[PDB]
Amino acid sequence: DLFDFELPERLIAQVPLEQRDASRLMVLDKHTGELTDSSFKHIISFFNEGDCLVLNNTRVLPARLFGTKEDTGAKVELLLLKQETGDKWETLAKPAKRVKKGTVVTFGDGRLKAICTEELEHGGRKMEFQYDGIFYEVLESLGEMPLPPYIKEQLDDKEAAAPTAGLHFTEEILQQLKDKGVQIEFITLHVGLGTFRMHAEFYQMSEETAAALNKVRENGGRIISVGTTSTRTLETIAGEHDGQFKASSGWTSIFIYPGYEFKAIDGMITNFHLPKSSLIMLVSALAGRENILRAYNHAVEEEYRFFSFGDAMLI
Template sequence: MDVSLFDYDLPNELIAQTPIEDRTSSKLMVVGKKTGERKDSTFAELPSFLQAGDLLILNNSRVRHARLLGIKEETGAKIELLLLKPLGSDRWEALVKPAKRVKPDTIISFGDGELKAVAENPTEMAGGWVFRLEYEGDVETLFSRLGEMPLPPYIRERLEDDERYQTVYSREVGSAAAPTAGLHFTKELLDKCKAKGVEIGYLTLHVGLGTFRPVSVENVENHTMHAEYYELSAEVASQIKKAKDEGRRVIAVGTTSVRTLETIANQPAGFRETSGWTDIFIYPGYRFQVVDAMITNFHLPKSTLLMLVSAFSTRNIMLQAYKTAVDKGYRFFSFGDAMFIQ
C-alpha cells in the first residue's frame, strides 16, 4: 500500500497555532465509520452523541518538560536535547540539535551544571543519541525547572500557558507530546458525560515522537513504529471487559488510547492489569478487537495516525471528511478541532 494514498492538501492557515480560549468550543465533526455520514457540531455537544453505558477511555499521560537547552562543556556551543524515553539507570534516548556537534563522551550542561548529559552512542533514529544524566536530587523536578514544553514543529506561536498543552485529567508524567484529542475536555464536560450514564476509565500511554514522525518509506507495510510505554490498571481492565461482555460501546479518546487498547486486546491474557511497550502499527486491513468508536483530532498528511483512522473507517470516507473539514475551515492538528468516528 503506497504512502501517497494518505496524502491530502491542507492550507497552512488551517494549522492551529494556539489553543482556543474555551476548550469545549472547538468544532466537532461526527462521522459514521461505515456510512461516511457527517454532521457538524461543537465539542460541548459531545454528550448528546453518547449513550448511557458507553465506556469512555482516556489517556492520563502528562507531557514532560522534555526540551532542554544547554551548552557543550568543551566549546560552549548551544545544544538542544529532546528527551524521548528513559532507558533505566539514568540513561535516556534523546533527539539532539545540532547532532553533528555530539560525539561519544560529549558533555552537555544545563542550568549552570545542575544537570549534565553525557553522550554514549547514537541510535538508529536520525539525530538520536543515548545519554547518561548526572544530577543531584529529583530529576523530574529538574526537568520541570530547567526544561521547556516540547511543542510540535508546526506550532510557531509561543504558548502562554503550558497547561493548555496538558489535558485537564493528566497525571502520569512521561510524554514527549500531548495526547491531543483529550485537550478538548473540561472537568465540567466530563461531569456532563457521567451524568448521562457514561462510564469513564483512564489508561496511560507515554506519547513519543515516533507516533507523529512522517512515514519515510514508500510502502506502508515497511514502516516501523517507535515503541511507547503503557500501563493499564486492574480496575479499568475490569471495566473494559465488562463493557465488552455486555455489548456496550468502548470509546477511545485519541489514537494513543486506541493503540493501547488494541495492543492489550491482542495479548493472550486479554484485559488484565498490565504494562509494557507497544509498537503496534494500525493501518487499513487491521481488524479492531475492542474499540467501537473514537474521538480524535485531524492528523498530518501521510501520517500513521491518518492511516489508523482510515483503518477504523475507510480511507475514502476519511479523506472525504478531511476535504470537508478543509472546505469548512476546521482547525487542524494539535490545537485544532476534533472528529468523533462512530
C-alpha cells in the first residue's frame, strides 16, 4: 500500500497526557514539506491576526419531540435543528415518509401540534408549531411529560464525548488567540442522526459564521480547521459554492484523498493516524503523500505519540 509505514503499537498513546499543552506539535509546511517540532503552548505563535479557527464545537442539543401523526394512526419523532422565523423550525423526522405536504403531528395532550410547511433537501422537514402561551415554556412542560402508552409501546424507552483533536484548546489559549487577533468560529456537527434519512454526520453552518469566514478570506487571512473531522464540513460547504461559505446544513460524506484540491482551509490541526486508515490520505492530500510520510517516519523516530490522544499536528 501507499499510505502505510511502521507504527509501534507503543508509540500509540494508550491514554492522553491531557494534563496540559504538553502534547507535542509536529508542524509541517504544506508546500515546502519542512517538518519542525514543538509543543502545544507555543501554538499561538503560528497564527497571525486576521486568522480564524473553526472549531467543531458539538452540542447534545438535538432535542427531540415524540409526537403522533394526527389524522392517521401515529408515531413521529422530530429532531429540532434550528429555529427560523417565529414558530418555524429546521427539523429531521423519523418515519420521514409519514410527514408530508402539510401533515399535522400532535404532542402529548395536544398542547402544541405542528404542521409540515415543507419537505427539505437533506430529507429534513420544516415544521411549524401551534400552541398557546410561551413556546419555550410549553416544551419544558412536555419535558416532564411521560410518553403516552399509545406511543410508548411503539418504542423501547421513556421520556458520547466530542472527540476532535480540538480539545488541546485550553480556555486560556482560546483567550490568547483572541487577544492576539485570531478569530474563532464554530461549526456544528451531529452524529447518531443518520437513522433519520446512512451513518453520515449532519453539519450546520450559520449565516454569521459563513459571513465571518468569507471576510477572512477576503481580507486575505488564513482559515485553519481544528477538527480531525470538521475540516470536511468546511471543505464540503465551500465545495458546493466555489470557495465561498454560506449558511447551510446537511449530511457530510466527502472523502478527501491526495489530488483533492482544498477550497476551504489553508491549514488544519489534527493528529497522526494509522498506516493506511483513511485519515492519512486526507492529510496526505493536504501536504502531499511524501512530505506527510517522512514526517510520519520522523514522528515515530522522535517517538511521538500517535492517534486519538497522542500529539497534535499542524499545517
